[PDB]
């Protein structure tokens, strides 16, 4: 069995939001429902990461560290893919019972956050990204940041990261293009991977603010609350080494 097929088989199931369509829409209602759903997406992300070949061999501390950094990169990219497979859109397919449409985008403060998510699905569409390439890219996003001093199992991590970089390369060759275009596609796809760092930084600005401002009454589940509580001090003390393909 191929390494890419092993990443395919562990693709998490589609979760429903539990959004009652009969009651009218509001930004607060939608944002609250999405945070609660986000916690359930992140609980499934732990199960997902554990089944990625090589991940369970890293020190337990490194496993926690990687999921804590990458949480938003994983969710924005997976949503971007899900929304791109239901395109031409212009829509964010958060769950089958909760799709952010053009009318939902008009709601106060909705667009300002949605636009960073819409950039991801627009890029996968523009570059006509395949399933195999996507699977390789999502695993590479779990391994896109490390602490300032590095990981406990850094050597093993660098070995695992190189392995999945090579896996991405195999999915590019399959598109049957000449080596000049093969270099072009890799440059293009790894540029989107690098640009995820900015998408996340933009999404986390409004997310950290809604979490810290208790007067906004915007609830986060225990799983999301725990990640944000851990991440805020690390971004504050500069304890993050964002890995870049292009300099």
């Amino acid at each position: 069995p191929t390494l890419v097929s092993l990443l395919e088989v562990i693709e998490p199931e589609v979760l429903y939001a539990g959004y009652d369509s009969s009651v009218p829409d509001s930004t607060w209602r939608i944002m609250t429902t999405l945070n609660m759903l986000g916690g359930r997406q992140m609980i499934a992300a732990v199960k997902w990461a554990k089944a990625i070949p090589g991940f369970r061999n890293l020190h337990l501390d490194d496993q926690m560290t990687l999921l804590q950094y990458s949480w938003m990169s994983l969710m924005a990219f997976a949503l971007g893919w899900r929304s791109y497979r239901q395109s031409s859109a212009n829509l964010l397919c958060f769950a089958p019972d909760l799709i952010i449409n053009e009318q939902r985008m008009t709601l106060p403060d909705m667009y300002d956050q949605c636009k960073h998510m819409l950039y991801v699905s627009s890029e996968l569409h523009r570059l006509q990204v395949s399933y195999e390439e996507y699977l390789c890219m999502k695993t590479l996003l779990l391994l896109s940041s490390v602490p300032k001093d590095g990981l406990k199992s850094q050597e093993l991590f660098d070995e695992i990261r190189m392995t999945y970089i090579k896996e991405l390369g195999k999915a590019i060759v399959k598109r049957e293009g000449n080596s000049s275009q093969n270099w072009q596609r890799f440059y293009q796809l790894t540029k989107l991977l690098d640009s995820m760092h900015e998408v996340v930084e933009n999404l986390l600005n409004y997310c950290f603010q809604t979490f810290l401002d208790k007067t906004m009454s915007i609830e986060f589940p225990e799983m999301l609350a725990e990640i944000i509580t851990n991440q805020i001090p690390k971004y504050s003390n500069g304890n993050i080494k964002k890995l870049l393909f292009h300099q």
Partner: peptide
């Protein structure tokens, strides 16, 4: 510190 995440990684799925 990060009780829920450590539990989810340590437990058998």
């Amino acid at each position: 510190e990060n009780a829920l995440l450590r539990y989810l990684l340590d437990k058998d799925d």
